[PDB]
Amino acid sequence: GEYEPSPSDWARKQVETYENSGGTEGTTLQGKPVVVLTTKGAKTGKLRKTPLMRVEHNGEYAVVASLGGAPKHPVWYHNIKAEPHVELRDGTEVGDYTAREVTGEEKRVWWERAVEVWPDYAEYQTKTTREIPVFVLTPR
Ligand SMILES: C[C@H](OP(=O)(O)OC[C@@H](O)[C@@H](O)[C@@H](O)Cn1c2nc(=O)[nH]c(=O)c-2cc2ccc(O)cc21)C(=O)N[C@@H](CCC(=O)N[C@@H](CCC(=O)O)C(=O)O)C(=O)O
């Protein structure tokens, strides 16, 4: 698409609409649901808000840290590593979670859930040179 913003400017615009509307607008991407993760900034201490694909199961969520399978980690990856207490907004509702990087069978199961929501995640694997981080968020 020739007449679209950069992916970074799109993410900024989406998170702005999402937050300013109290989760009543801007909550989808290609028809698929998006959440807003709030993390504590590792360096600055500021609260940082990031739109991510919604992957949910019985009140837990998972988030995938991957810029299209590229190896450089998103900055919010570092915020979670430093501070596991995060907030997650799903539409009009928000809550507190403990985020942890998962491994093994747990990671495989959540990855399958994520690929059902956002099939492109499977394609990203073909570009990888580092593990793809997956976090599971449990209510707290
Ligand atoms: C460009 C950078 O963003 P980032 O945290 O590297 O994240 C890159 C992307 O993951 C981010 O744009 C995502 O929202 C993109 N994104 C997804 N990204 C994903 O990785 N996974 C997804 O499933 C996903 C879905 C998605 C859906 C909609 C959408 O609009 C965007 C989506 C950024 O926002 N810069 C900030 C960083 C803010 C920050 O947290 N800084 C820390 C720095 C700490 C340190 O560097 O150690 C601080 O304040 O101290 C800034 O500096 O102003």
Structure-token match 């190896």, residue found: 71
Reported in sequence order, the residue ranges of 41-115 that DSSP labels E, i.e. its strands, are 47-53, 56-57, 60-64, 85-90, 93-101
**Segments making up each domain of the chain, as ranges:** 1-140
Would you say the CB of residue 11 lies under 6 angstroms from ligand 1? yes
Class of domain 1-140 (CATH, top level): mainly beta
Would you say the CB of residue 64 lies under 6 angstroms from ligand 1? yes
CA distance 38 to 97: 10
Structure-token match 């919010």, residue found: 76
Ligand 1, residue 52: give the atom nearest the CA: 25
Compute the distance from residue 51 Cα to the ligand 1 centre, in Å: 8
**Neighbour count for residue 116 (Cβ, 10 Å):** 11
Structure-token match 């837990």, residue found: 60
Would you say the CB of residue 27 lies under 6 angstroms from ligand 1? no
How was it solved? X-ray
The region that residue 104 occupies, defined by phi over 0 for left and psi between -120 and 50 for alpha, beta otherwise, is: left
